[PDB]
Amino acid sequence: PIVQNLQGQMVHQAISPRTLNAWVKVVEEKAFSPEVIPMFSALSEGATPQDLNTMLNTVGGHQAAMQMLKETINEEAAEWDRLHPVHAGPIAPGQMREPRGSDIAGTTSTLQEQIGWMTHNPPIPVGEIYKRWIILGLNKIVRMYSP
Amino acid sequence: PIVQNLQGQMVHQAISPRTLNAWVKVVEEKAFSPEVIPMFSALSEGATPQDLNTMLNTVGGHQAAMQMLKETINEEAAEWDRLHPVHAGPIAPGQMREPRGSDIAGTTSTLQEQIGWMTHNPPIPVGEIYKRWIILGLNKIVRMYSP
Amino acid sequence: PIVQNLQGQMVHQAISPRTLNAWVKVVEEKAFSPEVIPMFSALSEGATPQDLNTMLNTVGGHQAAMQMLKETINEEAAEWDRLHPVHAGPIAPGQMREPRGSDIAGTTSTLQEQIGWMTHNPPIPVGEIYKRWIILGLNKIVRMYSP
Amino acid sequence: TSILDIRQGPKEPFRDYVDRFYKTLRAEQASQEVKNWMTETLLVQNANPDCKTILKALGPGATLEEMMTACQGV
Amino acid sequence: TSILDIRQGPKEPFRDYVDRFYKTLRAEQASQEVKNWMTETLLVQNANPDCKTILKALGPGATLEEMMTACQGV
Amino acid sequence: TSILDIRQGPKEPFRDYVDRFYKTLRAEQASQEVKNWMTETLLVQNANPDCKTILKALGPGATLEEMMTACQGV
């Protein structure tokens, strides 16, 4: 995640193993139950896309759901690209590039790039955009997996 | 929560997973028992409204009680708005806006706004106002759930 | 691993026992399952070659696989040496030596040497080169150990 | 399971039923106004005859502690 | 176990089969286009006659929630 | 359960009863003066005849260690 250091700057720090394991354990115990979404939200505080793929990729089991989510993440990403067209002409030397759906999904962007966008002024909340897609896709799952 | 840093300022820091899990475990084990209220109170030390909705939203089970509480939180919030009318004329550029029942419930306010009110001079204790509503609503529950 | 200190420099710190044990436990529980690879990747964040041999050497069981991996690590290392020839003439006093496959595997290099390469400017990502060999060799294993 | 399929048993305490209701209501994502409509309507409708009778005597304006204490002996 | 060896039982819910499919598909490393081909093809082909019948009625263009809700009673 | 419903069994040690009393008293929220009234009154009143007899002999002014040691053999 990207956290604020004592000095008063935003720097990246790694997520903790008993945080990781707590994510694992939630999924083990409460599967598709709604409490998973606030839980997720708390444990995703200050998290990167990269950390969010890590959390999704580290799941075991419920592979039908994991595939449905993936496909929702790509749909929501396809929709990001649709709604926000690429911008006019070449990229400025003085500036950094606008993200695509795949940069938001973490796929085409690097960590330093993910830190550029979030730490820069104005900052862009690429975590929160992926977060809604995850929560939206979580609703899809919850609604389906209701019996 | 909003905690004091080493430098001597009040900054926000996230709540810990084994704190989260300790909140979960209390509820699992002691359900509606009175020891839940001091316990809550300790674990809510320096907590935001946002963190308090997180704690309430992460409950599983006892949904009749969770609904009774919600409805108590809104009643107490409706009462906040009643007792404290909005203030005269437009909001000053030099100042920040007075809270409503829904800002206290965390709903209409953002985190940075919740940090503005609490960290600013004079500070306003929007946690402690929600805390009484929670404790009051906890009494309602305890009294009902006595057999 | 090599981590950033508060002062703002990259220094080595040792890996933690409950990190070690978490590595052990993953292997115990999920053996050759694919979730092992993201898991590995997270727990290998900022890790040295030396720490990576430590992790491989501390395995118990699955010795056919452990040998297949070793032999993949040496093949990938032999390939490093092939693709990158040694450089022209004697090593400069002002400079430090280029790595070989065995320095990447951690074998011929010392820790201080592993810290020289990574911390120096430009830095060389000898972890990430070994990491791909490990992941590649993990694919070999996963594909074989599919039934 | 759908919210319409939530009903109170002939021997089931209301209490155990109300818990089931706000759990399933917890998996409905509809506007609050619709969920208010569901609350006043469906809960009583699928309540058992003995308690249903009881709840009709509370009239309208009733709140959950009073409903929950009202159908306790049933 | 190979992806061709993944098949639906005569009493096995489709759901439990689809889970097995994207787990084994999860251990295939092929190009995405090939994996798309596998998805539309092999899944239905090794599906049981009763559900297979059902899936033929969905036509093409169908998505996983609709397939998964379509073969639920089977 | 209501505080009036708290009573001592015919074979139940007083001690186990006094624990039940201040647990239920712990769920009463009344003024201290009322809760003092409940203490001196209801506790003895719902105490069993054998201990009740014992407690009558302690007279007034008695404190909990002396009541608790007084009804120990009963």
Short mmCIF file of all heavy atoms in Angstrom, two decimals, chain F residues 10-67, unseen atoms left out:
data_model
loop_
_atom_site.label_atom_id
_atom_site.label_comp_id
_atom_site.label_asym_id
_atom_site.label_seq_id
_atom_site.Cartn_x
_atom_site.Cartn_y
_atom_site.Cartn_z
N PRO F 10 -35.29 -24.78 46.12
CA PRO F 10 -35.39 -25.40 47.43
C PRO F 10 -34.04 -26.08 47.75
O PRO F 10 -33.80 -26.29 48.91
N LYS F 11 -33.20 -26.49 46.77
CA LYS F 11 -31.91 -27.17 47.04
C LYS F 11 -30.71 -26.32 46.60
O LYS F 11 -29.51 -26.63 46.66
N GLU F 12 -31.02 -25.08 45.98
CA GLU F 12 -30.04 -24.23 45.37
C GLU F 12 -29.24 -23.46 46.38
O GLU F 12 -29.90 -22.84 47.22
N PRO F 13 -27.95 -23.48 46.45
CA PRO F 13 -27.24 -22.64 47.36
C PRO F 13 -27.48 -21.19 47.11
O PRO F 13 -27.45 -20.78 45.97
N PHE F 14 -27.69 -20.44 48.22
CA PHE F 14 -27.89 -19.02 48.26
C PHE F 14 -26.95 -18.26 47.44
O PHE F 14 -27.26 -17.43 46.65
N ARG F 15 -25.69 -18.66 47.62
CA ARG F 15 -24.54 -18.18 46.83
C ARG F 15 -24.84 -18.17 45.30
O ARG F 15 -24.44 -17.19 44.62
N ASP F 16 -25.44 -19.23 44.75
CA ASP F 16 -25.63 -19.32 43.35
C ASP F 16 -26.80 -18.34 42.86
O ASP F 16 -26.71 -17.60 41.88
N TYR F 17 -27.74 -18.24 43.76
CA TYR F 17 -28.79 -17.24 43.78
C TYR F 17 -28.43 -15.76 43.93
O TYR F 17 -28.96 -14.97 43.20
N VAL F 18 -27.49 -15.45 44.77
CA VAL F 18 -27.00 -14.11 44.90
C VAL F 18 -26.22 -13.60 43.67
O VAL F 18 -26.28 -12.47 43.18
N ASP F 19 -25.50 -14.53 43.08
CA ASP F 19 -24.86 -14.32 41.76
C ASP F 19 -25.82 -14.01 40.68
O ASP F 19 -25.71 -13.09 39.94
N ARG F 20 -26.92 -14.82 40.63
CA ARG F 20 -28.04 -14.53 39.69
C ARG F 20 -28.70 -13.20 39.89
O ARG F 20 -28.99 -12.42 38.95
N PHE F 21 -28.86 -12.81 41.17
CA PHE F 21 -29.45 -11.53 41.55
C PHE F 21 -28.66 -10.36 41.11
O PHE F 21 -29.26 -9.54 40.35
N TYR F 22 -27.36 -10.27 41.41
CA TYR F 22 -26.59 -9.10 40.96
C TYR F 22 -26.22 -9.08 39.47
O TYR F 22 -25.94 -8.07 38.87
N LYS F 23 -26.36 -10.22 38.76
CA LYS F 23 -26.36 -10.28 37.30
C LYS F 23 -27.60 -9.62 36.65
O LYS F 23 -27.55 -8.74 35.84
N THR F 24 -28.79 -10.03 37.15
CA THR F 24 -30.05 -9.37 36.73
C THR F 24 -30.20 -7.93 37.16
O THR F 24 -30.61 -7.04 36.34
N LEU F 25 -29.75 -7.59 38.41
CA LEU F 25 -29.60 -6.25 38.99
C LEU F 25 -28.61 -5.45 38.10
O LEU F 25 -28.85 -4.28 37.78
N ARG F 26 -27.55 -6.15 37.63
CA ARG F 26 -26.58 -5.58 36.65
C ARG F 26 -27.31 -5.14 35.36
O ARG F 26 -26.97 -4.15 34.74
N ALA F 27 -28.43 -5.80 34.90
CA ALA F 27 -29.29 -5.38 33.72
C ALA F 27 -30.43 -4.51 34.07
O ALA F 27 -31.09 -3.95 33.22
N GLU F 28 -30.58 -4.09 35.35
CA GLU F 28 -31.53 -3.08 35.69
C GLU F 28 -30.75 -1.74 35.65
O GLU F 28 -29.56 -1.78 35.93
N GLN F 29 -31.42 -0.73 35.12
CA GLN F 29 -30.83 0.58 34.95
C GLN F 29 -31.41 1.62 35.95
O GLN F 29 -30.85 2.72 36.04
N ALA F 30 -32.40 1.32 36.85
CA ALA F 30 -32.98 2.23 37.94
C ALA F 30 -32.06 3.02 38.86
O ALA F 30 -30.88 2.71 39.05
N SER F 31 -32.55 4.14 39.45
CA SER F 31 -31.84 4.96 40.41
C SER F 31 -31.31 4.08 41.57
O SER F 31 -31.71 2.98 41.89
N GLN F 32 -30.20 4.50 42.17
CA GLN F 32 -29.38 3.72 43.10
C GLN F 32 -30.16 3.34 44.36
O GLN F 32 -30.06 2.28 44.94
N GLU F 33 -31.01 4.29 44.82
CA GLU F 33 -31.92 4.34 45.95
C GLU F 33 -32.96 3.24 45.76
O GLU F 33 -33.30 2.48 46.70
N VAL F 34 -33.49 3.11 44.52
CA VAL F 34 -34.39 2.04 44.17
C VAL F 34 -33.75 0.63 44.13
O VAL F 34 -34.25 -0.34 44.66
N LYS F 35 -32.54 0.65 43.56
CA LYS F 35 -31.73 -0.53 43.56
C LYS F 35 -31.27 -0.99 44.97
O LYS F 35 -31.22 -2.15 45.22
N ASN F 36 -31.03 -0.03 45.93
CA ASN F 36 -30.85 -0.30 47.38
C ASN F 36 -32.05 -0.93 48.06
O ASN F 36 -31.93 -1.96 48.81
N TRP F 37 -33.23 -0.42 47.68
CA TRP F 37 -34.54 -0.93 48.09
C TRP F 37 -34.74 -2.36 47.61
O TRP F 37 -35.13 -3.22 48.37
N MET F 38 -34.38 -2.67 46.36
CA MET F 38 -34.41 -3.97 45.81
C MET F 38 -33.50 -4.95 46.46
O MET F 38 -33.82 -6.11 46.70
N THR F 39 -32.32 -4.51 46.78
CA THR F 39 -31.32 -5.27 47.54
C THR F 39 -31.80 -5.73 48.87
O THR F 39 -31.88 -6.97 49.11
N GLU F 40 -32.20 -4.82 49.76
CA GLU F 40 -32.67 -5.24 51.07
C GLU F 40 -33.97 -5.98 51.07
O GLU F 40 -34.40 -6.62 51.99
N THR F 41 -34.76 -5.82 50.05
CA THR F 41 -36.10 -6.37 50.03
C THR F 41 -36.21 -7.62 49.32
O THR F 41 -36.64 -8.62 49.89
N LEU F 42 -35.92 -7.64 47.99
CA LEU F 42 -36.36 -8.72 47.11
C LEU F 42 -35.53 -9.95 47.32
O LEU F 42 -35.99 -11.08 47.35
N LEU F 43 -34.21 -9.77 47.54
CA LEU F 43 -33.24 -10.81 47.81
C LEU F 43 -33.71 -11.79 48.94
O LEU F 43 -33.77 -12.99 48.82
N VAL F 44 -34.09 -11.23 50.15
CA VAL F 44 -34.52 -12.04 51.18
C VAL F 44 -35.82 -12.69 51.01
O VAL F 44 -36.02 -13.80 51.33
N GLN F 45 -36.78 -11.95 50.45
CA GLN F 45 -38.13 -12.35 50.10
C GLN F 45 -38.11 -13.55 49.16
O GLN F 45 -38.88 -14.54 49.37
N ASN F 46 -37.26 -13.63 48.13
CA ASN F 46 -37.32 -14.78 47.27
C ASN F 46 -36.36 -15.83 47.59
O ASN F 46 -36.17 -16.81 46.82
N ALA F 47 -35.69 -15.71 48.83
CA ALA F 47 -34.77 -16.63 49.34
C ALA F 47 -35.58 -17.86 49.84
O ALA F 47 -36.75 -17.66 50.16
N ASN F 48 -35.07 -19.12 49.87
CA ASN F 48 -35.80 -20.29 50.32
C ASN F 48 -36.09 -20.28 51.83
O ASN F 48 -35.40 -19.68 52.65
N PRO F 49 -37.14 -21.00 52.34
CA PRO F 49 -37.58 -20.98 53.76
C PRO F 49 -36.35 -21.30 54.62
O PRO F 49 -36.23 -20.64 55.64
N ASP F 50 -35.51 -22.28 54.36
CA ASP F 50 -34.48 -22.66 55.30
C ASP F 50 -33.50 -21.54 55.51
O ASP F 50 -33.20 -21.16 56.63
N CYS F 51 -32.99 -20.94 54.44
CA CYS F 51 -32.15 -19.74 54.53
C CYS F 51 -32.80 -18.49 54.93
O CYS F 51 -32.21 -17.68 55.64
N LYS F 52 -34.04 -18.32 54.51
CA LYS F 52 -34.89 -17.22 54.90
C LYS F 52 -35.00 -17.10 56.39
O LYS F 52 -34.82 -16.03 56.95
N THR F 53 -35.23 -18.22 57.04
CA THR F 53 -35.23 -18.38 58.48
C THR F 53 -33.90 -17.84 59.08
O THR F 53 -33.92 -16.99 59.98
N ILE F 54 -32.74 -18.30 58.49
CA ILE F 54 -31.37 -17.95 58.87
C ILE F 54 -31.14 -16.40 58.81
O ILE F 54 -30.62 -15.70 59.71
N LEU F 55 -31.58 -15.79 57.71
CA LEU F 55 -31.41 -14.43 57.41
C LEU F 55 -32.25 -13.58 58.31
O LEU F 55 -31.85 -12.48 58.69
N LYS F 56 -33.45 -14.06 58.69
CA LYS F 56 -34.23 -13.32 59.63
C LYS F 56 -33.42 -13.15 60.96
O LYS F 56 -33.55 -12.13 61.63
N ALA F 57 -32.60 -14.18 61.38
CA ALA F 57 -31.82 -14.17 62.64
C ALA F 57 -30.63 -13.20 62.51
O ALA F 57 -30.18 -12.74 63.51
N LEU F 58 -30.09 -12.90 61.30
CA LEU F 58 -29.02 -11.93 61.23
C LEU F 58 -29.46 -10.50 61.65
O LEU F 58 -28.63 -9.63 61.86
N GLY F 59 -30.77 -10.20 61.64
CA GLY F 59 -31.33 -8.86 61.81
C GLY F 59 -30.98 -7.91 60.69
O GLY F 59 -30.39 -8.29 59.65
N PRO F 60 -31.16 -6.59 60.84
CA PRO F 60 -30.91 -5.63 59.85
C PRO F 60 -29.47 -5.20 60.05
O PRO F 60 -28.77 -5.66 60.96
N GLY F 61 -28.92 -4.35 59.14
CA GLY F 61 -27.58 -3.90 59.23
C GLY F 61 -26.62 -4.88 58.72
O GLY F 61 -25.37 -4.61 58.75
N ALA F 62 -27.00 -6.04 58.27
CA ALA F 62 -26.12 -7.14 57.82
C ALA F 62 -25.40 -6.91 56.46
O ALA F 62 -26.00 -6.32 55.55
N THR F 63 -24.17 -7.35 56.25
CA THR F 63 -23.50 -7.18 54.97
C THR F 63 -23.26 -8.50 54.24
O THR F 63 -23.66 -9.58 54.66
N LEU F 64 -22.92 -8.39 52.97
CA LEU F 64 -22.95 -9.59 52.10
C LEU F 64 -22.05 -10.75 52.51
O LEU F 64 -22.53 -11.91 52.47
N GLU F 65 -20.83 -10.57 52.92
CA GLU F 65 -19.98 -11.62 53.47
C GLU F 65 -20.64 -12.32 54.65
O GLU F 65 -20.70 -13.50 54.74
N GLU F 66 -21.23 -11.64 55.62
CA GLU F 66 -21.96 -12.22 56.70
C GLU F 66 -23.20 -12.91 56.20
O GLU F 66 -23.50 -14.00 56.66
N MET F 67 -23.98 -12.44 55.23
CA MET F 67 -25.12 -13.21 54.73
C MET F 67 -24.62 -14.44 54.03
O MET F 67 -25.22 -15.54 54.09
#
